Amino acid sequence: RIRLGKVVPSSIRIVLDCAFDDLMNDKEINSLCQQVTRCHSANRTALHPVELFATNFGGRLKTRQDFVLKGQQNNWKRYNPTTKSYLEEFESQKEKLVYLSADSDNTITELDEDKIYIIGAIVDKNRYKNLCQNKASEQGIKTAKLPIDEYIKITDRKILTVNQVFEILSLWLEYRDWEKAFMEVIP
C-alpha cells in the first residue's frame, strides 16, 4: 500500500483479549498467534499507530509465540502484553472500554481518542453464540460493532479475523472513511 502523510501516533488503545485459549485446538492457537503478529505489523506501519495491548496473555499462546519468533516479540513497541485482564490494567478507566462484537445493537461511527477498544482473541468465533457480548455485558461494559454491514455479506461478516478487525480500525484512523478502510482490508 501507499500511505499519504506524516506519521502521528494515536492516544487510542486497542486490546487483544487473549483469555479464550480454552476454546481452541493447537492449530487454532497457531493461527491466532499469526494474527496477533499481524496486528502488530499493521500497527508498525500505520499512519496513526496505537498502543496495542495483549491482556490475559499466557499459556499455549505465549508458548507458540516465543517458539515461532524466538524472542523478537520482546522488541516490539508500542506493544504491551500482560497476564492481567483488561479489567485490571484499566481499573481506573473502565467506562472508557468498548468491546467490539458483531452481535451488538450498537454501532461505532467513529473512534474516540480517549477510548479503549477490545478485540476478542478468538479463532472461528462463530461457534460461540454471543460469546463476546455475554462477556462484556456481564462486566457492565459497552459493546459495539463496526459500521460495515453495507459492505459485507452477513455470512462473511462472521468470518472476519482478529487482524482484519484491527486493520479496519487502524486504517479508519488514516482515512476517516469506514468504506475506504474496509475495502483496503478485504478485497
Swiss-Prot record:
Going by the record, the broad EC class of this enzyme is transferase
Q: Primary place of residence?
A: cytoplasm
Gene Ontology cellular-component terms for this entry are: cytoplasm; nucleolus; nucleus
> What's the Enzyme Commission number for this chain?
2.1.1.221
An example GO biological process term is: tRNA N1-guanine methylation
Q: State the active site.
A: D124
Which key words tag this protein in UniProt? Cytoplasm, Methyltransferase, Nucleus, Phosphoprotein, S-adenosyl-L-methionine, Transferase, tRNA processing
| Sequence positions that bind S-adenosyl-L-methionine | L100, G120, D124, K125, N126, R127, Y128, C132, L146, K158, I159, L160
The molecular function terms of the Gene Ontology recorded here are:
tRNA (guanosine(9)-N1)-methyltransferase activity; tRNA binding
Q: What is the effect of changing R38E?
A: Completely abolishes interaction with tRNA
* Residues in SAM-dependent MTase TRM10-type domain copies: 1-187
Subcellular localization(s) per the UniProt record? Cytoplasm; Nucleus
Q: Its family?
A: Belongs to the class IV-like SAM-binding methyltransferase superfamily. TRM10 family.
Quaternary structure, per UniProt, is:
Monomer.
- Can you name this protein? tRNA (guanine(9)-N1)-methyltransferase
Species source reads: Schizosaccharomyces pombe (strain 972 / ATCC 24843) (Fission yeast)
Q: What's the gene? A: trm10
